[PDB]
């Protein structure tokens, strides 16, 4: 007997189903580490990350909400991205969009 214990149903949960996805190769060209959150607008990440910024427009990382991907200096990796939904209006970040798309 464990007070407040869970009895979790075995299995897996599929995340962000029915949404457009794409893969991009990213390389950290900076000399300091960069970590990117699940919901950050990927096209507006730190300029030291080198990748196809046009392909990432309107996309975020396809990872569990609240998690992150770390890029140590020099690190190259392929990441999977998922399209933003709702109104698809981007405001904030580096101030590159500030409106619909």
């Amino acid at each position: 007997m464990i007070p407040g214990e869970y009895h979790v149903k075995p299995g897996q949960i599929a995340l962000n189903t029915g949404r457009a996805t794409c893969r991009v190769v990213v390389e950290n060209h900076g000399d300091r580490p960069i970590q990117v959150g699940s919901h950050y607008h990927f096209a507006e990440v730190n300029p030291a990350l080198k990748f196809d910024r046009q392909q990432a427009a309107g996309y975020r990382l396809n990872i569990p909400a609240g998690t992150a991907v770390r890029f140590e200096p020099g690190q190259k990796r392929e990441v999977e991205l998922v399209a933003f939904a709702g109104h698809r209006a981007v405001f904030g970040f580096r101030g590159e969009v500030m409106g619909p798309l």
């Binding site: 464990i2 007070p3 214990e5």
Partner: protein, 100 residues
């Protein structure tokens, strides 16, 4: 003594540990508040002795075992945290999984 509110608050923790210490001596299996108070007061006295934070983080895991507490108590306590005045001022001691 010019006791500040934090010093008076720690008097409450010391008193709760005296209750726990007397129950442990009678051979009772300790409950949740008794176990937390007992391990917490041990850490405060270790700080008063001048033990280091790294030594108490380890020593605090050997105050109570699973056989000296009620069923479910180790799982109700994932960690214990307490601050005390060390020779080099207030420091936080975090003891991970103290009851095994």
């Amino acid at each position: 003594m010019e006791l500040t509110p934090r010093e008076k608050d720690k008097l409450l923790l010391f008193t709760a540990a005296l209750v726990a210490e007397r129950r442990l001596a009678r051979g009772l299996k300790l409950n949740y508040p008794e176990s937390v108070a007992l391990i917490s007061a041990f850490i405060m006295e270790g700080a008063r002795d001048g033990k280091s934070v790294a030594s108490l983080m380890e020593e605090g895991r050997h105050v109570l075992t699973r056989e000296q507490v009620m069923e479910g108590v180790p799982e109700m306590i994932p960690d214990i945290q307490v601050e005390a005045t060390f020779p080099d001022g207030s420091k936080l001691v975090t003891v991970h999984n103290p009851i095994i």
